[PDB]
RNA sequence: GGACGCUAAGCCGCCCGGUGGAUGGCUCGGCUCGGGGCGCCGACGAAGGGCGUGGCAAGCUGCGAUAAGCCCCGG
RNA sequence: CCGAUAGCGAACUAGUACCGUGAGGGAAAGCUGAAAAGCACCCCGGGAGGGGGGUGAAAAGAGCCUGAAACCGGGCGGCGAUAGGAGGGUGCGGCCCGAAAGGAAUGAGCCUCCCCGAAGGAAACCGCGGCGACGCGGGAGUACGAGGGGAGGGGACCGGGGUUGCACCGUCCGUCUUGAAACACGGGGCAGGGAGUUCGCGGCCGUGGCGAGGUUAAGGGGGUUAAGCCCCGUAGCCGCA
RNA sequence: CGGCCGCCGAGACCCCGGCGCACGGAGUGAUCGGGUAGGCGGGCGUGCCGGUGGCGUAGAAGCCGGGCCG
RNA sequence: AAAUAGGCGGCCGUGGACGAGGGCUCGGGUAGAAGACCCGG
């Protein structure tokens, strides 16, 4: 399924990523981030943090981080990976957009959620002759776009 | 088990019998013989043909709450209804006795017992 | 209703509410049971056995309600699971409710529903 | 139809189950020892019996014969 | 003055999606018992083992360069 | 009799993978659907991944029947940046919803009247006392009182759930200990596994049969597909000194 | 410190009903109600067997959440 | 942030209108672990 309901060829645009291998972190703090923007502005904010000249604020998780200039919490990074994946599929949103006959450049982000997947684990050595888990997580995200409306 | 508790249904039809008796003619003896067939089957009356002989009211209706143990000798002319009768027994009251009849059928003989006297 | 004095003492002892019937901590510990299921206390720390102030009231023979409640709901009437249309005799409106199975099939059920309408008995849910 | 573990329950929280404490239960010690565990020995390591006489002793004598000169009458 | 005029981060419950593999049904397998059979074989070169062998073969299974087989009889 | 964190170590290429100089040690891995129809063709995506559309059921679309909890994300409802904690219990307020299984519409929370009425038991004011505090007499066992009964009014929630404020109380759990909230011991959390069984003998008990007797074992006959039950067998044991 | 007086304040004590236990037959108890070690007694649940009697695609078990009873 | 949460003076408001203060920006530090602080533009 998806986590919102869609009807999706008429009043809604929709993709979704499986098995990209991303903080979750990074992933909750772009989510919340981006709702409630227009598309448009979603790709703006993506193009600058790739460039590292926009800090997104970590404000739901807030350790060992320094602090960064002017306002808002100081902790925050720049998730870059995250940043260069999430923009293949507002390319994709975008697109899909264009064949529904929707308008593919006024679009709002209504609701936009990560998903904590499957867990690619193996190990790496540590003294002594133990062996400890080397992992990465994988996570699935998805994203759904509605229509204006007054 | 190791609990009480009679499973012969002819026994515990028998001991409701006794208590119909005891409120309504309101007399001992029927109340007495209920006690007696509640009590454990190694604590039920063994009776001797011989302990008969040596030991009763000529002529008078004994109760017997367990069962009456012949091969013995008897020329005492008692009448006896009980619980139980060996066959051996069981020939030997009518014999040389009164006669032989099972405990239910005391009932007809004194709804309330008159000249009855109750045998361990 | 059922009576008067009925309807008041069981919304008494709905409203205080009987036990817990989960010793001691189950918000902290799902690790000891749900609210259900009352265990015997089998501690030597347990401050419910003794019968602690701020800790609640413990099973006891007292708390046996009327035996007009007991046994029963509390509008008196007595259920009987229904399978099959053989089964629903003798059922009476004067005592009994009957309860409709989730498995019971549309065709024996038509049957079953009728006959219990007829009976005058009352039912979980319309039909 | 009773077995051993039903008379037990799954009792009281009792840990040992109608033998008090448990750490009297955990082997063969707790006994007394295993067996009989002496009686004309020198050690009283079983004094008094299981009858209060304490203990009763063994090893007392009289003859019995060969089994084919007895006879038992009948 | 008291007012919701904006209280972020967060706490608690529930809900929805994922994660996870418990749970039920399923079982060409074990396990135990009863009956019968098998009841020896080999330097006349055994058993066991190794390496090959198939159109494509990684393992298993079957065979021996006559290589997942050849012949005869009966069914 | 057991059933895939069980029964053989092994139900599935298993004594395999694998370890050790060797002797020797030793796992895990069962399930599509009626039929593979196991996804043509098209848009997008560097993309073989994924997404959109077409796929009887696809929430049966590839260790795919079912699909728990711990847990992660977003959201909803409540609380929240001057106030205190074994995380709550009980009473009483707020806010929040409640289609169903409950009770009630043949009357729910609720309100009102009348009466009965346990334990208990005033006031106003008066009189007389007391250094006074205050007592005593009358008011008066009255007014009053839990609880119950009946009647009436109203007409849809109430119970119950989520969360929270206030008043009050509240130092886990299990074990060890004379004493545990403990600076005694043990616990990250959830799920699954996880400990009173069999035989012989002795002493008890309850029930049941028979009775001065009681009981047959082994065996073969028999019956049956086999077998049990049914009958024979009293060898032998025990009691009757 | 020595007198004195009025109140507050427990699951106590009192009181109404309900409930168990004990006793009464085929109501009664001023002289009944704490509870570890330990003894005694009753019920529930679990798998499979046998007998008996039912249910299922016109929708089983299991799962999840909610209601209700003891 | 002394909850007796202070005083004075000035500045301001009045997805889906408009927008005072303020930061990020740039050139440097009297400043300086990150940030902040300060000054010029």
């Given at each position: 399924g998806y986590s919102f309901q869609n009807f999706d060829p008429k009043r809604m645009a929709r993709a979704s990523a499986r098995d990209l291998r991303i903080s979750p972190k990074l992933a909750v703090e772009v989510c919340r981030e981006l709702r409630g923007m227009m598309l448009n502005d979603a790709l703006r904010y993506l193009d600058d943090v790739i460039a590292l000249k926009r800090p997104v604020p970590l404000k739901r998780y807030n350790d060992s981080q320094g602090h960064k200039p002017g306002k808002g919490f100081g902790p925050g990074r720049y998730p870059v990976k995250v940043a260069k994946a999430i923009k293949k599929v507002l390319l994709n949103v975008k697109n899909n957009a264009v064949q529904k006959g929707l308008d593919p450049d006024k679009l709002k982000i209504i609701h936009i959620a990560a998903h904590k997947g499957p867990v690619l684990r193996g190990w790496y050595p540590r003294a002594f002759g133990r062996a400890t888990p080397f992992n990465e997580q994988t996570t699935h995200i998805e994203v759904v776009v509605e229509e204006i409306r007054r | 088990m190791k609990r009480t508790g009679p499973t012969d249904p002819n026994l515990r039809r028998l001991i409701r019998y006794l208590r119909k008796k005891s409120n309504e003619y309101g007399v001992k003896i029927w109340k007495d013989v209920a006690w007696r067939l509640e009590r454990p089957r190694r604590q039920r009356a063994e009776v001797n043909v011989s302990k008969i002989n040596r030991y009763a009211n000529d002529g008078e209706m004994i109760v017997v709450p367990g069962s009456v143990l012949g091969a013995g000798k008897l020329e005492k002319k008692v009448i006896v209804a009980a619980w139980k009768f060996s066959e051996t027994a069981r020939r030997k009251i009518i014999e040389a006795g009164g006669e032989a009849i099972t405990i239910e059928e005391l009932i007809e003989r004194n709804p309330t017992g008159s000249g009855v006297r109750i045998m361990e | 209703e059922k009576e008067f004095k009925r309807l008041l003492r069981v919304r008494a002892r709905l409203k205080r509410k009987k036990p817990r019937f989960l010793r001691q901590e189950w918000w902290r510990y799902p690790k000891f049971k749900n609210d259900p299921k009352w265990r015997r206390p089998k501690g030597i720390d347990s401050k419910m056995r003794l019968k602690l102030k701020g800790k609640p009231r413990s099973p006891s023979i007292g708390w046996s309600s009327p035996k007009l409640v007991r046994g029963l709901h509390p509008s008196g009437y007595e259920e009987v699971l229904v399978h099959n249309v053989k089964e629903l005799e003798a059922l009476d409106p004067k005592r009994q409710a009957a309860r409709i199975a989730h498995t019971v099939g549309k065709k024996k059920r038509i049957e079953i529903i009728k006959r219990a309408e007829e009976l005058g008995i009352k039912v979980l849910n319309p039909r | 139809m009773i077995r051993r573990r039903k008379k037990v329950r799954?009792?009281?929280?009792?840990?040992?189950?109608?033998?008090?404490?448990?750490?009297?239960?955990?082997?063969?010690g707790s006994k007394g020892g295993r067996g009989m565990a002496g009686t004309g020995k020198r050690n009283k390591s079983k004094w008094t019996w299981t009858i209060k006489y304490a203990p009763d002793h063994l090893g007392k004598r009289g003859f019995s014969r060969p089994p084919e000169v007895q006879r038992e009458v009948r």
């Open positions: - | - | - | 799954k009792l009281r929280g009792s840990h040992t189950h109608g033998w008090g404490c448990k750490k009297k239960h955990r082997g063969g």
